């Protein structure tokens, strides 16, 4: 369930 | 020549999914490999063109591949596939 994004997007 | 990916570098991101992505290797399964009422899941290998899957079921076992649509040059590649199929299967099951 947890968006990829939450770990793999550094913005 | 530019790096290409390896069976070295394919054992090390397998590894890393299985140890800790569980859930997202089942989710694979059922979106798409075509399987229903997956108990769990586990990558066996990646390649240039696609990866293979051992999947549990009712009891049962088997194994099975899915393509990909462009083949993979490098682990950039295989990083990126795995991340967008992940999140267009998320979005199957929360529509
Ligand atoms: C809660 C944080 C978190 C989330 C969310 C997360 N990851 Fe990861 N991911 C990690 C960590 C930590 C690593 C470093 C390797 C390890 O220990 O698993 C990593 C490594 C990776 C790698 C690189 C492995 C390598 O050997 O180069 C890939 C590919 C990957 N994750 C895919 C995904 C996908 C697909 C999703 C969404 C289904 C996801 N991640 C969501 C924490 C996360
Ligand atoms: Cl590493
Ligand atoms: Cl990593
Ligand atoms: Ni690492």
Redesign the pocket.
């Given at each position: 369930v947890?968006?990829?994004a939450?770990?793999?997007t550094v913005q | 020549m530019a790096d290409p990916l390896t069976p070295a570098i394919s054992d090390?991101?397998c590894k890393?999914?299985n140890?800790?992505?569980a859930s997202?290797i089942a989710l694979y399964a059922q979106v798409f490999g075509q399987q229903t009422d997956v108990t769990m899941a586990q990558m066996q290998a990646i390649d240039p063109t696609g990866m293979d899957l051992v999947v549990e079921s009712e009891g049962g076992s088997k194994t099975i591949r899915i393509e990909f649509e462009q083949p993979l040059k490098d682990?950039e590649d295989?990083?990126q596939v795995?991340?967008a199929?992940?999140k267009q299967a998320?979005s199957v099951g929360k529509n």
């Open positions: 947890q968006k990829c939450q770990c793999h | 090390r991101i890393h999914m140890e800790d992505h997202a682990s295989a990083h795995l991340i199929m992940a998320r």
